[PDB]
Amino acid sequence: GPEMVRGQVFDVGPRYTNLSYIGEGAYGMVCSAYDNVNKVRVAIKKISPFEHQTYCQRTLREIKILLRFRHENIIGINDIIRAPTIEQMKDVYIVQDLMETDLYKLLKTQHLSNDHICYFLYQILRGLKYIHSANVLHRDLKPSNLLLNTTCDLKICDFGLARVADPDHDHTGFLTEYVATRWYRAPEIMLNSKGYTKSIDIWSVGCILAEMLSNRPIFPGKHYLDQLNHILGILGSPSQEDLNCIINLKARNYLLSLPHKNKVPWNRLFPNADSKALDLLDKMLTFNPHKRIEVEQALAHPYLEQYYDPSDEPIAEAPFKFDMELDDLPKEKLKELIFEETARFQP
Template sequence: MEEPVPAGKTKFTSGGTTFIVDDRYEYIKKIGHGAYGVVVAAIDHQTNTKVGIKKIPNAFEDLIDAKRILREIKLLGFFDHENVISLLDVQLPPARTGYNDIYIVTDLMETDLHRVIYSRQDLTDDHIQYFMYQLLRGVLYIHSANVIHRDLKPSNLLLNKNCDLKICDLGLARGYDRETENLTEYVVTRWYRAPEVILNSSMYTKQIDIWSCGCIFAELLGRAPLFPGEDYLDQVQRVIGVLGTPNSEDMNFIGNPAARRFISKLPKREKMRWQTLYPKANPVALELIDKMLVFNPEKRWTVEQCLGHPYFQDLHNPEEEPLASEPFDWSFDNFEPTRDLLTNFIYEEALKFHPIN
């Protein structure tokens, strides 16, 4: 016998996964399968809009992952920006503890930048400019809230038909004035990692997101990843192969003597010309990428400098580039995860959308 569906709920199956959600939602189709679960499109009959519903099954099996999901829910609940995905609902679990699944409802986006880059769709300089402008506008807002995203890559940038872009997947985000507790483990898919991350520097700043944005920019220009390293040593060699061998001043941030020795033993490389790599690109775009993909994080441009670059002169307007109203409060994050604590925290987040009288 199947369990009866609770009152006020609806049940459907998509991609072999069963969803039980509030009956205001009507299933349309499956959209994707992420690292953490299945995403479907649905109609929200309360607001008459299309939404995305992500089910994270057995969410508490891995407590580190569950803590990441909590972090993402907290951040998305705090953020309010056109270029960051909006959290519309967290389904109220049946009890404070003892449940297994989490359902998160967000804006519905049709595709992501990774799919667009590797599609046959023509990408003009106007497209690239608009995607990069929206990405940097979103990063400006995230940084102004005292948050580093740490995992920017094309598949984490969602798009819809009119080219609106929204940043998602904030589970790896961190505050940048906090203790750097083992910050290296999960940061950024390797191809988009800044040199200071690969070389295990303790110098973690907002500039790691600018490096990732530069890698995304290059991927838009060349329709292929710029630094597809097979392991972290290969990654360093590929970066140096394009940017040239760093001088001793530009290696000052590397606190690890072994990493410095490794670089000094590599054959000396000259910097490649961006025009050679991307002969069809707008030269103004290449001027900007040159400021973003800088080995030394202290010399890499900030997001404010990037937005002010001539490449965005038709789009950039500081008055329409909002900042966060206050810094994000990271104090909640300072706990040793247990299943009971995490289920309780997620329940509290869901209560914000479903107040119980």
């Protein structure tokens, strides 16, 4: 019999055995397993994407990116199990390093010391430096996408929404749809942006920093436009200069339709926080994406001075590229690319 976990097939033997359910991830069931080759427990997530084009797109994005990335602060893919033949292939099993928890869970239970916050933020930005050096955007950074171990080591995961950066094609309408998690969206997303620039990830990191400082999401919008109102509830109404940068006619009109809001000083929002952390937070949560701090500058910020060290901050060999643009491909074609991409792990 293939191994079973809570009524579900988990066909990862004989190599991986001694399974334990650990949770539901974004794609399906995840277990811990004993790897009989490397003599260690690992994480295995069961993906069943093939009925839907979007699940197929995200699965392929994640696999292609994570096979190509290698970095301490980024989750790997160690092994992939799928069927010998494509018709047989209904599930893909992605094997990853087993971690202890994620930041989302840690923040439910623990107030973090300034030291831990500083180190966590370093690691996020260290990993993001590498991602960005490959001209890749994560586009869904949030606490639950940051895995942690007992040692405070941090790995960014869940690259299903990643894209190659494309600042030339960033511009789009007002009210455009967006996939990434609401609370971590930059203001421009709700205004003129498709999220194809690096500044999109920096915003999300700033939201995570705020959350590490207080154990509350800084901008817990309930709906699309509400999110932006929460943002402006802290940043205040945008400056003249920043209004003038938005090209969408609709967007700046929408902004002018809103009631004026007073900027809430960071001092006041986080009274016990390190002033250096707040200065960096300010620079990450800047309304105008052009003026927003970049990953290398954030790393070089005084707050992270005990860690910043380019000699210990690897970068990618060269820019990433999709071989095919994945969004005009039907699911049967995406299933074939997934088959191909996973063949290097077949006996």
